[PDB]
Design a protein around this motif. Structure first.
Motif, PDB file in Angstrom:
ATOM      1  N   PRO B 136      -3.545 -15.395  -9.964  1.00 39.45           N
ATOM      2  CA  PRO B 136      -3.544 -13.435 -10.645  1.00 39.45           C
ATOM      3  C   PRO B 136      -4.314 -12.375  -9.428  1.00 39.45           C
ATOM      4  N   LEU B 137      -5.430 -12.376  -9.758  1.00 41.04           N
ATOM      5  CA  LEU B 137      -6.401 -11.545  -9.057  1.00 41.04           C
ATOM      6  C   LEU B 137      -5.601 -10.814  -7.840  1.00 41.04           C
ATOM      7  N   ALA B 138      -5.335 -11.983  -6.821  1.00 40.84           N
ATOM      8  CA  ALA B 138      -4.951 -11.614  -5.830  1.00 40.84           C
ATOM      9  C   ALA B 138      -3.699 -10.786  -5.078  1.00 40.84           C
ATOM     10  N   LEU B 139      -2.746 -11.278  -7.161  1.00 40.96           N
ATOM     11  CA  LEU B 139      -0.850 -10.497  -6.824  1.00 40.96           C
ATOM     12  C   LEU B 139      -1.262  -9.599  -7.521  1.00 40.96           C
ATOM     13  N   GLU B 140      -2.411  -9.104  -8.520  1.00 40.55           N
ATOM     14  CA  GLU B 140      -2.274  -8.207  -9.214  1.00 40.55           C
ATOM     15  C   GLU B 140      -3.161  -6.906  -8.168  1.00 40.55           C
ATOM     16  N   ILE B 141      -3.996  -7.377  -7.462  1.00 41.65           N
ATOM     17  CA  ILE B 141      -4.957  -6.637  -6.653  1.00 41.65           C
ATOM     18  C   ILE B 141      -3.747  -5.834  -5.826  1.00 41.65           C
ATOM     19  N   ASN B 142      -2.250  -6.870  -5.189  1.00 40.76           N
ATOM     20  CA  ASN B 142      -1.495  -6.237  -4.554  1.00 40.76           C
ATOM     21  C   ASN B 142      -0.313  -5.172  -4.688  1.00 40.76           C
ATOM     22  N   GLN B 143       0.006  -5.509  -5.873  1.00 38.42           N
ATOM     23  CA  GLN B 143       0.419  -4.822  -6.980  1.00 38.42           C
ATOM     24  C   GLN B 143       0.091  -3.675  -7.050  1.00 38.42           C
ATOM     25  N   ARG B 144      -1.084  -3.693  -7.520  1.00 43.83           N
ATOM     26  CA  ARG B 144      -2.158  -2.078  -8.065  1.00 43.83           C
ATOM     27  C   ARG B 144      -2.227  -1.239  -6.559  1.00 43.83           C
TER      28      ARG B 144
ATOM     29  N   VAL E 203      17.298  -6.223  -9.516  1.00 40.67           N
ATOM     30  CA  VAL E 203      16.201  -4.385  -9.594  1.00 40.67           C
ATOM     31  C   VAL E 203      16.426  -3.982  -9.581  1.00 40.67           C
ATOM     32  N   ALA E 204      18.235  -3.352  -9.320  1.00 42.64           N
ATOM     33  CA  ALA E 204      18.432  -2.017  -9.515  1.00 42.64           C
ATOM     34  C   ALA E 204      18.037  -1.439 -10.905  1.00 42.64           C
ATOM     35  N   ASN E 205      17.726  -2.299 -12.037  1.00 37.50           N
ATOM     36  CA  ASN E 205      17.772  -1.893 -13.646  1.00 37.50           C
ATOM     37  C   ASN E 205      16.037  -1.420 -13.741  1.00 37.50           C
ATOM     38  N   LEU E 206      15.358  -2.460 -13.679  1.00 39.32           N
ATOM     39  CA  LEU E 206      14.079  -2.073 -14.051  1.00 39.32           C
ATOM     40  C   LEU E 206      13.430  -1.850 -13.459  1.00 39.32           C
ATOM     41  N   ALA E 207      14.007  -1.648 -12.029  1.00 41.23           N
ATOM     42  CA  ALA E 207      13.062  -0.646 -11.020  1.00 41.23           C
ATOM     43  C   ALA E 207      12.573   1.026 -11.662  1.00 41.23           C
ATOM     44  N   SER E 208      11.126   1.492 -11.132  1.00 42.15           N
ATOM     45  CA  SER E 208      10.947   2.423 -11.823  1.00 42.15           C
ATOM     46  C   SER E 208      11.965   3.632 -10.760  1.00 42.15           C
ATOM     47  N   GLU E 209      11.795   5.079 -11.794  1.00 44.83           N
ATOM     48  CA  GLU E 209      12.427   6.117 -11.229  1.00 44.83           C
ATOM     49  C   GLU E 209      11.832   6.521 -10.226  1.00 44.83           C
ATOM     50  N   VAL E 255       4.247   8.722 -16.531  1.00 49.38           N
ATOM     51  CA  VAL E 255       3.427   7.978 -15.471  1.00 49.38           C
ATOM     52  C   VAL E 255       2.668   7.066 -16.142  1.00 49.38           C
ATOM     53  N   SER E 256       2.187   5.773 -15.907  1.00 48.40           N
ATOM     54  CA  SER E 256       1.900   4.800 -16.382  1.00 48.40           C
ATOM     55  C   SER E 256       1.438   3.820 -16.304  1.00 48.40           C
ATOM     56  N   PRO E 257       0.324   3.851 -15.857  1.00 47.24           N
ATOM     57  CA  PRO E 257      -0.219   2.497 -14.490  1.00 47.24           C
ATOM     58  C   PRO E 257       0.337   0.825 -15.477  1.00 47.24           C
ATOM     59  N   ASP E 258      -0.075   0.270 -16.441  1.00 47.63           N
ATOM     60  CA  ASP E 258       0.560  -0.840 -17.303  1.00 47.63           C
ATOM     61  C   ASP E 258       1.726  -0.948 -16.690  1.00 47.63           C
ATOM     62  N   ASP E 259       2.528   0.100 -17.135  1.00 47.97           N
ATOM     63  CA  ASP E 259       4.125   0.307 -16.984  1.00 47.97           C
ATOM     64  C   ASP E 259       4.980  -0.619 -16.051  1.00 47.97           C
ATOM     65  N   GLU E 260       4.452   0.878 -14.358  1.00 50.25           N
ATOM     66  CA  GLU E 260       4.209   0.792 -13.219  1.00 50.25           C
ATOM     67  C   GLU E 260       4.536  -0.977 -13.141  1.00 50.25           C
ATOM     68  N   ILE E 261       2.454  -1.838 -13.342  1.00 49.59           N
ATOM     69  CA  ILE E 261       2.484  -2.780 -12.838  1.00 49.59           C
ATOM     70  C   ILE E 261       3.492  -4.199 -13.949  1.00 49.59           C
ATOM     71  N   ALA E 262       3.419  -4.022 -14.608  1.00 43.36           N
ATOM     72  CA  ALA E 262       4.128  -5.046 -15.709  1.00 43.36           C
ATOM     73  C   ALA E 262       6.418  -4.870 -14.481  1.00 43.36           C
ATOM     74  N   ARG E 263       6.776  -3.620 -15.025  1.00 41.96           N
ATOM     75  CA  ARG E 263       8.150  -2.846 -13.916  1.00 41.96           C
ATOM     76  C   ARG E 263       8.312  -3.719 -12.765  1.00 41.96           C
ATOM     77  N   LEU E 264       7.164  -3.604 -11.945  1.00 47.19           N
ATOM     78  CA  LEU E 264       6.693  -4.216 -10.590  1.00 47.19           C
ATOM     79  C   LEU E 264       6.516  -5.160 -10.349  1.00 47.19           C
ATOM     80  N   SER E 265       5.695  -6.244 -11.513  1.00 44.90           N
ATOM     81  CA  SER E 265       5.843  -7.587 -11.653  1.00 44.90           C
ATOM     82  C   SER E 265       6.933  -8.503 -11.801  1.00 44.90           C
ATOM     83  N   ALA E 266       7.501  -7.573 -12.685  1.00 44.61           N
ATOM     84  CA  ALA E 266       8.736  -8.575 -12.496  1.00 44.61           C
ATOM     85  C   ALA E 266      10.164  -8.386 -11.961  1.00 44.61           C
ATOM     86  N   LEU E 267       9.444  -6.463 -10.774  1.00 46.50           N
ATOM     87  CA  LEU E 267      10.417  -6.635  -9.638  1.00 46.50           C
ATOM     88  C   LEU E 267       9.995  -7.569  -8.794  1.00 46.50           C
TER      89      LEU E 267
END
Lengths: 49, 301, 49, 98, 300
Positions: B136-144, E203-209, E255-267
Motif C-alpha cells: 500500500p505504501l508502494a502504490l500510494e507513493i507512486n500516486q504521490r 475515467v472520463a468522469n472522475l479525472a482531475s480538471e 487544489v487539494s492533495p487528498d482529492d488528487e490522491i483519492a480521485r487518481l487512485s479510483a482512476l
C-alpha cells in the motif's frame, strides 16, 4: 604553437563541444545507440582522467 | 540453482566485512547467467542524471531479482528464489514491516544519500540496492510522485508550492520521508513527462470518444448501465461547457482513419502506463524478526 | 476565357506546380541523388509519365 | 567452473604485441554523413510548417503513427536506422564537424 | 492427479509415432483435468470451428487446462500437468521468435501465410491443432487489435471496415507477419465492449480538471516530436469537437492533495478494470531459450 585552428571547435561552449560531449548530448537527449567518431575527441572527462 | 558473481577489482577484507552485513537481501540482475561480472549487479548500470525514476521502475519490473546467500574470497554465491518457497530477506528498506504485510520492490529514492549505502562503493561504481516497500505504501507513493509530476509544470504560484510541500512529506507508522521532487532545474524528467502526458491524453480521448462509442454500442440491446453512463456524461457536459461557446458542432460523421488512430493511440498511451498502474507483488512475510532487521518471507512471482 | 482571365485569379489559393517543374530545377549531379523525387516520373528518354 | 587467476611475475614490461597484417577493411570509407535526425529524434523546430518543410526537403521522414516503438525510440533510443537492402560495400561511416 | 494417461482408438504406424516423438515437451490443452482421458477431446480439434469466432476459442482456451506432452510408447501418451512454480521446458512450433527474458501467453493459432495445415498428427478425420505460444507483447497486441476491430466496426458498411482491417489484421512482430482469421463479432465481445465503454466513461468522469487540460499546458510550454504528434492529435480532436479557439488555462482553484490522491487512485482502479480486458496473465517465464528457437526452459 598557434592559439586555435578552429574557433568554432575548441572553445568550451562551441557547437561541436555541445554537439559531441556525451555530457552535453545527455543534457540534450541524444540517441545513445548511435556511435560517432569524433565523440572520442571532444569528451573532456576521460581526457582529464 | 546458484549464481556466482565475481569482482574484477581489488577488495579489502574490511570491504568484505562491510559487504557481509548485507547477507540475505535482494539484488537485481538483468538476466540469468551462471557466472556474471559485478558491473551488471545492482542498478548502477541504469542510474544516471537524465533517465529518472520511472525508467528504474520499468526496467526493475523485468529485472530478475536474486537473494544473496554467501560471500567468498572473491566471488558471491547468489541464490535465485522460487515460487511458493520461504526464504529470509533482510529489511534494508526504509520502512519497518509487520507480520502479514505484502511486499513489492521499488527503486530507491535517496540516490547518493548521507549513508552512501554505508560506504560500499568502488571506482566509478556505487552498489545500489532497491527498496523493499509494503504494497500500500508502494502504490500510494507512486500516486504521490505522479501528482507531484502533474503540478511540476505549474510551479509559478505559491499555493501549489505549499501543496507540493505537503506532497514531499509522507506519513506512515513511525515513518516520515521527504520525497524528492521529480522536477529539477525547472524542468521535469523525461519519464515522468511522458507518463503524465500519456495519462492526461488518455483522459482527454476518453472524454471526447465515450459518447460516440456508447452510442455505437447502444444502437444494440440496451441496459440501465449504458443509460446511466450516458447520463453521467451528460452531467459532465452540463458542468463542463458552462463557459465554452455554444454550437461546437460535433458531427456524427467522422472518417474511419481518424477514430482507428484515436483508439490505437489511446490504447498505446495507456499501454505504456501499466508498469506504474499494476503493482506486481513479490513477497509476503510469515514471520518478522525482532527489531525488524530481517523477515522470513514467502516468494511471489 | 479571353474575358474571364481574372476569374481564375478571383479565387485566392496557391496552386501546386507540375512534376515537370519539380524536375527542371535540379542540377545534373543532384538529379541522381536519392533526395530527388521525380525519378518515378521518368521512364523513357522519349516520353514523360 | 574453474577459477584461475594470473600474477605478473615480471617487472616493467615482459610481453609485447604487434599489429602486423591487414586482412581487409570492414567499412567502405563511405561518405554517407551522419543522419543527425536519427541521433536527435526528439528535437523539432518551433514553428510547425518550417519543420515539415525542412524534413520534406531534406528527405527525412517523420514517424507516421505512434506506437510503443516510437516512444521507446524517443525515450530510450534504439535501432532507428534500418538495415539497407543491398550492401556490397559493407559497413558505412561518416560524421561531420564545422 | 498429476500424470494424465490418454489413449488412441486407432493404431499408430511408425510414421505416426515418429512425428509424435518430436512433440515432447509441447503444451496441449485439456478441458477436463481428469485422469483416464480420451484423444478426441485432446487438443483443440473438438473446439476449432471456422466462421464461429476467434474470441470464443480465445476464451475457452484461457479457460482450458494446460499440460505437457512427454513419453509416448505406443497407444499411450502420458500427459503431465505442470505444477505451479517449478521450472519446466517447452517446445513450440508456432513460427514466432522468442527471448530469454520475456513472458508468454497461449493463444489460438493463426495462419502464417505458407498455409501448411499439417501439424504432424492426423487420425482419419481427426487432426491435432496446437495452441500458439506467443510472447507477451505480441499477445497483448493481438488482444488490443481484435478489441479495436470489435469496437470500431459497429454500424459501418463493409467497405470502410474492409479498408480498415486489411491494414489492421496484419501484424509484423520481429520479422514475422500474422493475420487474424475470424474477427466475427460476439455477444461475449459485446460484453467486452460494455466493460470498455463503462471504464472509459468512468475515467472520463472522475479525472482531475488539470489533467483534462494538462496537454494544453505542455503544448504551450514545450515542443517535442512526440509532443508535436500529440498536439496534432489533440487539436484535430478539438476541431472535430469545436471550431472555437481552446482557451489558455489559469491558476487552478480546487487544489487539494487528498482529492488528487483519492480521485487518481479510483482512476487507477478503473484503468486496471479496463486493462484486464487485454492484459492476459502470464503462463511462462523464460529461464533459457534454445539457439534454434525451437525449445526453451520456462519457470512456471
Amino acid at each position: 604553437f598557434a592559439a586555435t585552428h578552429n574557433p568554432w571547435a575548441s572553445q568550451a561552449g562551441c557547437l561541436s563541444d555541445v554537439l559531441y560531449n556525451t555530457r552535453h548530448r545527455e543534457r540534450l537527449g541524444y540517441n545513445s545507440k548511435f556511435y560517432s567518431p569524433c565523440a572520442q575527441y571532444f569528451n573532456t572527462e576521460e581526457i582529464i582522467a | 540453482a546458484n549464481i556466482f558473481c565475481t569482482f574484477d577489482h581489488k577488495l579489502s577484507i574490511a570491504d568484505v566485512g562491510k559487504l557481509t552485513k548485507l547477507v540475505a537481501a535482494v539484488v537485481p540482475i538483468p538476466q540469468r547467467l551462471h557466472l556474471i561480472k559485478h558491473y551488471q549487479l545492482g542498478l548502477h548500470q541504469f542510474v544516471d542524471h537524465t533517465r529518472g525514476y520511472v525508467r528504474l521502475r520499468g526496467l526493475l519490473r523485468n529485472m530478475t531479482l536474486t537473494l544473496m546467500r554467501r560471500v567468498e574470497g572473491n566471488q558471491i554465491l547468489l541464490h535465485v528464489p522460487t515460487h511458493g518457497l520461504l526464504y529470509t530477506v533482510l529489511n534494508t528498506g526504509p520502512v519497518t514491516w509487520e507480520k502479514g504485510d505484502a511486499l513489492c520492490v521499488l527503486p530507491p529514492l535517496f540516490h547518493g544519500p548521507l549513508a552512501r549505502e554505508n560506504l560500499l562503493t568502488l571506482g566509478q561504481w556505487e552498489l545500489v540496492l532497491p527498496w523493499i516497500v509494503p504494497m500500500p505504501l508502494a502504490l500510494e507513493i507512486n500516486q504521490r510522485l505522479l501528482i507531484m509530476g502533474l503540478f511540476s509544470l505549474d510551479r509559478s504560484y505559491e499555493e501549489v508550492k505549499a501543496a507540493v510541500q505537503q506532497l514531499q512529506t509522507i506519513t506512515f507508522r513511525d515513518a516520515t520521508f521527504t520525497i524528492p521532487d521529480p522536477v529539477i532545474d525547472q524542468h521535469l524528467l523525461i519519464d515522468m513527462k511522458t507518463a503524465c502526458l500519456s495519462m492526461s491524453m488518455v483522459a482527454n480521448l476518453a472524454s471526447e470518444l465515450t459518447m460516440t462509442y456508447v452510442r455505437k454500442l447502444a444502437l444494440e440491446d440496451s441496459s440501465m448501465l449504458l443509460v446511466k453512463c450516458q447520463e453521467l456524461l451528460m452531467r459532465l457536459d452540463r458542468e463542463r461547457s458552462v463557459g465554452e461557446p455554444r454550437t461546437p458542432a460535433r458531427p456524427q460523421h467522422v472518417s474511419p482513419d481518424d477514430e482507428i488512430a484515436r483508439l490505437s493511440a489511446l490504447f498505446v498511451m495507456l499501454r505504456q502506463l501499466d508498469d506504474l498502474i499494476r503493482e506486481q507483488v513479490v513477497f509476503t512475510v510469515c514471520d518478522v524478526s525482532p527489531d525488524n532487521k530481517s523477515a522470513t518471507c514467502i516468494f511471489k512471482g | 476565357a479571353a474575358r474571364r482571365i481574372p476569374h481564375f485569379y478571383r479565387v485566392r489559393r496557391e496552386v501546386p506546380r507540375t512534376v515537370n517543374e519539380m524536375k527542371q530545377d535540379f542540377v545534373v549531379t543532384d538529379f541522381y541523388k536519392v533526395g530527388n523525387i521525380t525519378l518515378y516520373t521518368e521512364l523513357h528518354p522519349f516520353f514523360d509519365f | 567452473t574453474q577459477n584461475i587467476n594470473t600474477v605478473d611475475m615480471g617487472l616493467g614490461y615482459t610481453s609485447n604485441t604487434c599489429v602486423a597484417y591487414v586482412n581487409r577493411v570492414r567499412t567502405d570509407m563511405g561518405v554517407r554523413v551522419q543522419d543527425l535526425f536519427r541521433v536527435f529524434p526528439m528535437n523539432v523546430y518551433r514553428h510547425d510548417e518550417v519543420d515539415r518543410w525542412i524534413r520534406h526537403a531534406a528527405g527525412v521522414e517523420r514517424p507516421q503513427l505512434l506506437d510503443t516503438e516510437t516512444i521507446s525510440m524517443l525515450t530510450f533510443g534504439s535501432m532507428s536506422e534500418r538495415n539497407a537492402a543491398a550492401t556490397v560495400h559493407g559497413q558505412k561511416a561518416a560524421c561531420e564537424l564545422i
